[PDB]
DNA sequence: CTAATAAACTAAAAACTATTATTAT
DNA sequence: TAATAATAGTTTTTAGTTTATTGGG
């Protein structure tokens, strides 16, 4: 697949930098180190896994192997930590502007063939399997090197050497009083408005972002059969799955050193150790007990080679859509051991949309597993306005309940309303219908988990508020109602009885 | 690219969670 | 509760001959008091079991008066059974040479149901009945045994070897018995027990009567004997000024066994030799043993683990309002896809029991929704303990009443993404058209419904829903062969599980020439496993 | 646990090879702490890890009571891990060294605790019996070859049964690659035919196994497997003593003829350990044999040249048996060797 | 372009290689127009696995050096990626510049030739 | 009571808690009455297996060993259990460098 | 050790960084031979706070300890002494500290 | 007069690289 | 005499307990 990321942000040390025409605005320097530890975090919240680094240039000092002058690098290519975030923290604000100025530099000449050298060559200092470029930089200026015509030729040359050799990089627009005025040095050097403002893309990157997003990987590598010989390799995912707190990690009182876990059995009446062999599986049914071993429990266990084996062909409104198991799966063609499999898939969803029929299919996910009842549910490829598929092809995965999975339901009768009251709470419903849309639901629960996690780490003066959605606007409502309430209560119920007990 | 996560390479840019807007 | 049942078999010989092609209903009918025995006593409820038996060689019975009560012998009476039936079961039934009435069995069975009941707080009382009606009867007391049971209400499921209404197969999809082979005693009985039935019950007690070998396919011998589990007596929130109490039931859940498998010495064979625990212990600093209550939680913040403790998480962590459940949202039902539909138990939520203005309320929400398409989002919390969730709930009439099924729903955490190619653009697999027609034959060869003639219902070849788990019969089986001998290798998987687990065979056979036909026209090679 | 655990167990591997005798001061704790640690549930470690198997087989040390009691601990530990793994029809077929590991702690340990007073001894017999493909590299069979080969005397009086089919396997064992595979097929080989020796010494009926496969493979010889059979042949003169005691100098006088027949290779040392083992089981020696017999031996001596160690080792061995044979008559002794070294 | 077993790729690297040497045996240049067919042919596809990369390049290299000069950068990020004979390949690739001395010092200093030089192999 | 003649000391380190417990309670049981191991009387020393002579000298305090008491492990007092009666402390005895 | 006073008495040394950093803190300490933890335990007699932030409110909520100022052990650093226990250096503190308290007038 | 049970919890197995013995001569 | 083909080693679900948490009688 695509390993490792690298993302590397770049600013000039300047005092256009350190200030800014409305006072009460933000410096470009505080507003990037204030945006810049925003995607951290947010990073290390969702895909911790990659590589990150800080790297200064303009100074009064530099920090680098290559001891290319005012070059100052401050944090090399790393997954983050908090000690990073902490260490680029102290540095925001009026103060930490102003500690930076005192033990820093800031402000002198340099070129940009040599700062695109260094970060290349600090890229080319990572042994991972690198996945993307992103060399973020941010400046106010758009003729740095205007100059030395020389300049902006070698700089320019070495952008042409670093696209050559599948580097990728991207510009910030800051603040301009005077407009940042893009295709100026750009559009060209670099792979519209002029620009007066800033806010292009880090708006998006202020905004808190906290997920996983796991990456491509297949959920099992599978060999579907239809009756005894047909081999078609076939490929299974999920859309979705449960998003859980990450595990605890015991660790060790004083030290905090995460301890090893130790488990062992030993004899009560001999009090020696016993051994894994001497383990028996017992379970007391009646009088006698039953004595056995795990290996032929899960023998036992044992019945199926894995496979999907298709037990025919169903309509899928004979099916009664309530019947649910689990998360729904979905399946892709495949063409790594067998070739042309998705010739089949092709076909056969084709076959299956004309004719809207499910595929009953057993299936079998792992050795040693017991067997299940599946039926195939095809799905079409659905685009969105700029042609972006919204809808993945290919087929859900629905699970039937067995008989004993149906719970026994307590007798119900069918009661009748007035059709007026059900004109009412439709007027109702049409009072406050509106569109479910899935990317405005999460689960602020962990949200808060992780939020008291930042404050604890970083030591936040506040555990971060988390912002439910799940608790309704009560008072919308009930203005947009208000008399209806009391009339579907005189309506319905009898004017003397409370709903509580 | 536009409608893809800016801050994660292959994947799309989410909408922060707005709740529900009644009509 | 406890339930009185008793469970009453013929031991003459009629069903006793050797049926040449076909299990004879002696077999059929000891191969489903096997199966109804060992789910009965692995499930160790608190229902006790009498032994009653007709056609005995001997004759033991608590209203014997000779020629009637006759060749009726009874082993022992309404207690619990143990692994002695079983092996009696599986020995003493034998082919038996005596043959007299079940009406004399019956009366004789609830005779000791109605004298063993007192002392005994009993949830219901049951009784079932196996026989091929292959013996000549005198229809005496059967009007007589109608009305005891209208003077006791005592549930009665039948079951007989013959199909109440092809390929050899047991439980699965075929003809349990043919039309040609029942007699003129067989239909005599068949005429017989329908009336019975229907004087007790009616129609739905006619489908109460199932075949021998496709009763292990259902759990409708069960169905007498189930008891409902908990449910979320709770309040409806609508704002703040509408609530309705309700007493919400969990539909559907993937059943999982209570008991599992314990650790026991080779020698001891208990618990109590066994010491297992768990020792930790500075690894760094040379195995420094560990205090339990010296030992912290953390968790991986960035490159780096924080040190982090419990009770600090719990006291400044989110926290949830007792069993909050309150709707959220109004949106058409187009909007949601079957595929979101998360949660894995499925909950039926109902209002309180017997609130009449809250039964009316709600169906008339019930039939709004059904005229608008409409369903509305519900945030769930089950109680301060549990985390508090949100789905979508909504309504569903049958023939005899309504109900509402709620489902919960995810979240962007929840939701994975992918980037899939688009099979319509893949000219590299894009099949030819006599290959879509050979498709298109085998999936006419393989469906699995036709349009039913003179009804506008579907027919279903495959009522999988009413077929319960297999896993657990095998693992039942192999239980009770251990227990009797712990000495053999285990059984395979015996025929007839595949039998109501696998397909008729008439699709296959109509689907095999297709098979080839697809085959053949569509070149593949596959690579090593 | 990694790569680490790798060369660390070869490191103890080695030292226990190399220092004998005086760093076995120290050994006995180290070992059961590596015991311990076995017997721990949580089996973290990886399928080659679990070499610390046969690691625990120790013999630089007189082995005191110790792990003397342990034994028995072990020898459990030991069946249930090969029951629980190599049943090739339990869904478990993966032994990448597992079975290896059994093979050089069995061969480490049972050198010197094993008795053939047990059901345990037909039990481990058999699933050495159980020994289908491993690529060219056949680390399992040349193990449990290498095993049987090393301890056939403590695998004796139980196989008397499928004889046959070890027969056919060892023979087809010494017909693949990997070298290594086809010398420890040998070694089984003569081990085998060593314990079905002494079993037709003390047998009564040890004709049937007799009519059965020796005058068979001899008659169906008619490259190294020929000189195996040739071996054998030889060798087997215990019954032929028992029984049809004129059958002993009568098959003598064959195989000297086709002495003389391949007189006038890689043959004779065959020839030379067979006329000493039948000279071991003779008594009575037709004399007009014994100049050819000195002839044949110093011409056998002139071919030590053009010889791999190999053979130059078996070479000697043989011209030891034989003259250690010769031993038993003493006038015959002395003549015979006075003529050979003269010759020589 | 197909690399499955290393002699096929390994022969057509060759025989490019002397091919563009011994065009019209170097009394002309007109098939230029196919060196960066076999340029891009390569890069594409190959700057993406890199595996083969290296080999090709020292295979082509031994006899055409100044086909690098579309890959100097290239073969410059590289560098710090390997550990053993590739390394001593990438190595002659940058000796099979022995024409474009342009700056290359700040360039070693950059990757740390010295430990690399370190490590004993003649 | 077959244990009634044992004085015999168990140290927490290197045993677990429950098994040091248990290994209390049942020479407690059988008569054999515990004693501090830098205490005199102390007819054996309850560690782990791989003690060292050194480490439980550092470990318990001790410039020298107690007099009479044997540095045995565990299994030689577990056996003694599982057959109740005594076994030698040989193959259970940790060397004692000068 | 030099100090003579800083044994027993657990110090939870985890927050010193009012304007002193953390280490310097400790290394002290330590030469004075004093007890280092940065998490309550049932040793920790007084636990030092530097900062003011969730852990203090935790340690209100959960009042299993107190609130030391850094003031008392840089005196104790200085003068080689034990200065004893006034409110002063005190915001949070144990309900056991607030009868030992009320012996000196209430709190 | 004594319960499913939601959440927490550890366990177990697949997926994806992942170099590393391994035959030919 | 010197190659390439099996091939383990980290995430990551997921079942498998376990629990501690209610009202049932």
New binding site residues.
């Given amino acids: ?1 695509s ?1 490792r990321d690298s993302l590397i942000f770049l600013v000039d040390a300047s005092k256009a930098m350190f200030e800014s025409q409305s006072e009460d605005e933000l410096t470009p320097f505080d507003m990037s180190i204030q945006c810049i530890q925003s995607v951290y975090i947010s990073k290390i919240i969702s895909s911790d ?1 990659d590589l990150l680094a800080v790297v200064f240039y303009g100074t009064e000092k530099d920090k680098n192997s290559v001891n290319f002058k005012n070059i100052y690098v401050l944090q090399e290519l790393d997954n983050p930590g908090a000690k990073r975030i902490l260490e680029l923290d102290q540095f925001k604000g009026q103060q930490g502007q102003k500690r930076f100025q005192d033990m820093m530099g800031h402000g002198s000449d340099y070129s940009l063939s040599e700062v695109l050298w260094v970060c290349a060559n600090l890229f080319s200092d990572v042994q991972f ?1 690198m996945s993307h470029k992103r060399i973020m930089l941010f400046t106010n200026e758009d003729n740095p090197h205007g100059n030395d015509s020389a300049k902006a030729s070698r700089a320019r040359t070495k952008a042409g050497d670093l696209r050559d050799t599948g580097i990728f990089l991207d510009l910030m627009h800051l603040k301009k009083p005077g407009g940042f005025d893009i295709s100026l040095f750009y559009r060209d050097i670099i792979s519209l408005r002029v620009h007066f403002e800033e806010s292009s893309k880090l708006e998006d990157l202020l905004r808190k972002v906290r997920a996983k997003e ?1 990456r491509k ?5 599978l060999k579907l059969k239809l009756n005894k010989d047909i081999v078609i390799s076939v490929g299974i995912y ?1 859309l979705v ?2 998003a ?2 990450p ?2 990690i ?1 660790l060790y009182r004083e030290t905090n050193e995460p301890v090893k ?1 130790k ?1 062992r059995t030993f004899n009560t009446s001999t009090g020696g150790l016993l051994l894994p062999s001497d383990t028996k599986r017992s379970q007391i049914y009646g009088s006698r007990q039953i004595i056995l071993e795990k290996e032929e429990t899960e023998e036992l266990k044992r019945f199926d080679d894995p496979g999907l084996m298709l037990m025919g062909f169903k309509p899928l409104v004979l099916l009664k859509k309530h019947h649910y198991l ?1 998360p729904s799966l979905f399946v892709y063609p495949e063409e790594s051991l067998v070739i042309g499999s998705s010739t089949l898939f092709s076909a056969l969803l084709i076959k299956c949309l004309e004719k809207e029929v499910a595929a009953l299919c057993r299936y079998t996910p ?2 040693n597993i017991p067997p299940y009842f599946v039926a195939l549910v095809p799905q079409e490829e659905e685009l969105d306005d700029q042609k972006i598929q919204v809808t993945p092809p290919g087929f859900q995965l629905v699970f039937l309940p067995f008989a004993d999975d149906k719970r026994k339901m307590p007798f119900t009768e069918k009661i009748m309303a007035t059709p007026e009251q059900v004109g009412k709470m439709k007027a109702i419903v049409e009072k406050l219908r509106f569109t479910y849309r899935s990317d405005s639901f999460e689960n602020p629960v962990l949200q808060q988990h992780f939020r008291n996690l930042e404050a604890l780490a970083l030591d936040l003066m506040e555990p971060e508020q988390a912002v439910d959605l799940t608790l309704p606007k009560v008072e919308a409502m009930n203005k947009r109602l208000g008399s209806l309430v009391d009339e579907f209560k005189e309506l319905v119920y009898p004017p003397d009885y409370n709903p509580e007990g | 690219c536009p409608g893809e996560s800016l801050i994660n390479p292959g994947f799309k840019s989410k909408k922060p969670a707005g709740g529900v807007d009644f009509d | 509760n406890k339930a009185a049942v008793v469970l009453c078999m013929d031991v003459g010989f009629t069903m006793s001959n050797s049926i040449p092609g076909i299990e004879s209903p002696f077999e059929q009918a000891k191969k489903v008091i096997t199966m109804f025995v060992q789910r009965q006593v692995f499930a160790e409820n608190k229902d006790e079991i009498a032994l009653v038996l007709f056609g005995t060689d001997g004759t033991d019975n608590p209203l014997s008066g000779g020629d009637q009560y006759q060749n009726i012998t009874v082993h022992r009476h309404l207690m619990l059974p143990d692994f002695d039936l079983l092996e009696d079961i599986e020995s003493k039934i034998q082919p038996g040479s005596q043959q007299a009435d079940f009406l004399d069995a019956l009366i004789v069975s609830m005779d000791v149901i109605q004298h063993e009941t007192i002392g005994k707080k009993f949830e219901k009382r049951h009784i079932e009945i196996f026989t091929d009606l292959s013996s000549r009867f005198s229809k005496s007391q059967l009007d007589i045994i109608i009305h005891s049971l209208k003077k006791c209400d005592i549930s009665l499921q039948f079951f007989l070897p013959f199909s109440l209404g092809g390929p050899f197969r047991l439980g699965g999809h075929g003809p349990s018995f043919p039309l040609k082979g029942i007699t003129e005693q067989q239909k005599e009985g068949l005429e017989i027990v329908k009336m019975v039935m229907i004087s007790l019950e009616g129609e739905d007690g006619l489908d109460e009567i199932y075949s021998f070998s496709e009763s292990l396919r259902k759990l409708c011998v069960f169905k007498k004997i189930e008891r409902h ?2 449910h979320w007596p709770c309040r409806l929130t609508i704002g703040s000024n509408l609530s309705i109490r309700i007493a919400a039931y ?1 539909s559907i859940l993937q059943e ?1 066994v ?1 008991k ?2 314990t650790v026991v010495d080779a020698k001891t064979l208990k618990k109590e030799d066994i010491q297992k625990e768990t020792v930790y212990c500075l690894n760094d600093d040379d195995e420094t043993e560990v205090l339990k209550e010296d030992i912290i939680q953390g968790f991986r913040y960035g490159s780096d683990i924080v040190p982090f403790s ?1 009770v600090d998480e719990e006291q400044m962590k989110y926290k949830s309002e007792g069993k909050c459940f309150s709707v959220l949202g109004f949106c058409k039902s187009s909007q949601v896809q079957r595929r979101f539909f998360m949660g894995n ?1 499925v909950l039926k939520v109902f209002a309180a029991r017997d609130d009449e203005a809250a039964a009316v309320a709600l169906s008339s929400l019930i039939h709004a929704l059904d005229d608008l398409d409409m369903v509305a989002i519900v945030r769930y919390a ?8 949100v789905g979508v709930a909504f309504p569903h009439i049958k023939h005899n009443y309504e109900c509402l099924v709620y489902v919960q729903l995810p979240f962007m955490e929840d939701l994975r993404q992918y980037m899939f190619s688009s099979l319509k653009n893949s000219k590299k697999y894009a099949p030819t058209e006599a290959q879509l027609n050979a498709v298109d034959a085998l999936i006419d060869s393989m469906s699995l419904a036709k349009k039913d003639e003179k009804t506008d219902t579907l027919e279903d070849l495959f009522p999988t829903t009413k077929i319960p788990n297999p896993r657990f019969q095998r693992l039942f089986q192999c239980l009770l062969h251990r227990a009797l001998h712990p000495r053999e290798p285990l059984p395979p998987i015996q025929q007839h599980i595949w039998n109501m687990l696998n397909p008729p065979a008439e699709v296959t056979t109509k689907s095999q020439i297709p098979l080839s036909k697809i085959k053949t026209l569509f070149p593949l090679i596959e690579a090593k496993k | 646990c ?1 790569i680490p655990a790798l060369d660390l167990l070869i490191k103890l591997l080695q030292t226990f090879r190399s220092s004998r005798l005086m760093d076995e001061f120290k050994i006995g704790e180290l070992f059961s702490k590596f015991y311990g640690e076995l017997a721990l549930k ?2 973290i470690p ?3 890890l679990e070499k610390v198997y046969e690691l625990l087989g120790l013999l630089g040390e007189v082995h005191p009571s110790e792990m003397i009691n342990n034994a028995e601990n072990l020898f459990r530990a030991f069946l249930g891990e090969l029951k629980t793994q190599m049943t090739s029809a339990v869904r478990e077929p993966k032994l ?1 060294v597992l079975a290896g590991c059994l093979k050089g702690l069995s061969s480490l340990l049972c050198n010197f605790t094993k008795s053939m007073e047990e059901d345990p001894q037909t039990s481990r017999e058999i699933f050495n019996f159980v020994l289908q493909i491993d ?3 056949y680390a399992v069979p040349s193990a449990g070859l290498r095993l049987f080969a090393l301890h056939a005397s403590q695998f004796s009086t139980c196989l008397l049964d499928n004889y046959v089919s070890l027969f056919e396997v060892l023979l087809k064992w010494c017909a693949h ?2 070298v290594e595979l086809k010398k420890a097929a040998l070694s089984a080989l003569e081990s085998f035919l060593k314990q079905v020796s002494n079993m037709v010494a003390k047998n009564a009926e040890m004709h049937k196994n007799k009519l059965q496969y020796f005058m068979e493979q001899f008659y169906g010889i008619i490259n190294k497997e020929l000189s195996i059979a040739i071996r054998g042949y030889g060798l087997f003169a215990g019954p032929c003593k028992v029984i049809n005691a004129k059958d002993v100098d009568f098959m003598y006088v064959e195989l000297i003829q086709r002495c003389k027949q391949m007189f006038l290779v890689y043959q004779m040392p065959s020839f030379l350990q067979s006329v000493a083992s039948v000279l071991l089981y003779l008594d009575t020696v037709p004399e007009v044999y014994t100049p050819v017999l000195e002839h044949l031996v110093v011409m056998q001596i002139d071919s030590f040249p053009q010889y791999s160690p190999k053979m130059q080792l078996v070479c000697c061995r043989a011209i030891v048996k034989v003259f250690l044979a010769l031993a038993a008559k003493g006038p015959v002794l002395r003549n015979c060797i006075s003529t050979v070294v003269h010759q020589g | 372009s197909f690399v499955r ?3 096929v790729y390994a022969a057509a690297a060759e025989v490019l290689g002397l091919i563009l040497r011994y065009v019209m045996e170097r009394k002309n240049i007109l098939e230029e127009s196919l060196c960066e067919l076999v340029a891009k042919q390569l890069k594409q596809h190959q700057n993406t696995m890199e595996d083969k990369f290296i080999v090709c390049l020292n295979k082509v290299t031994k006899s055409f050096p100044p086909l690098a000069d579309r890959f100097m950068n290239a073969v410059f990020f590289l560098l710090p990626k390997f550990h053993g004979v590739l390394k001593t390949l990438c190595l002659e690739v940058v000796l099979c510049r022995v024409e474009g001395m342009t700056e290359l010092y700040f360039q070693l200093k950059s990757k740390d030739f010295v430990q690399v030089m370190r490590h004993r192999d003649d | 009571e077959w244990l009634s003649s044992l004085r015999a000391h168990v140290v927490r380190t290197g045993i677990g808690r429950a098994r040091a417990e248990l290994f209390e309670k049942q020479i407690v049981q059988h008569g054999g009455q515990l004693c501090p191991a830098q205490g005199p009387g102390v007819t054996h020393i309850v560690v782990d297996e791989g003690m060292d002579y050194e480490r439980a000298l550092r470990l318990l305090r001790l410039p020298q060993l107690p007099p009479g008491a044997q540095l045995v492990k565990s299994a030689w007092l577990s056996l003694c259990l599982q057959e109740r009666r005594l076994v030698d402390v040989a193959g259970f005895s940790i060397f004692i460098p000068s | 050790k030099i100090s003579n006073i800083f044994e027993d008495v657990e110090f939870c040394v985890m927050s010193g960084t009012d304007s002193q950093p953390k280490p310097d803190l400790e290394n002290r300490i330590a030469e004075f031979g004093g007890y280092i933890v940065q998490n309550p335990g049932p040793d920790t007699y007084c636990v030092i706070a530097g900062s003011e932030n969730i852990r203090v409110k935790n340690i209100i909520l959960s009042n299993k300890h107190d609130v030391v100022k850094p003031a008392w052990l840089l005196e104790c650093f200085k003068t080689k002494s034990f200065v004893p226990w006034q409110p002063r250096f005190m915001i949070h503190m144990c309900p056991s500290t607030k009868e030992h308290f009320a012996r000196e007038y209430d709190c």
């Fill in positions: 697949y390993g896994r399997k796991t990987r297949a959920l099992s590598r999920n799955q449960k859980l707190k595990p605890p015991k876990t488990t689990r792992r050795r | 589990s908990i969990k999982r209570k599992t498998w419990k138990q089950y109680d301060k303990r549990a985390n508090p969730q | 990694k949580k089996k990886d399928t080659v990448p690529l060219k590299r690659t990997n | 077993y290393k002699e």
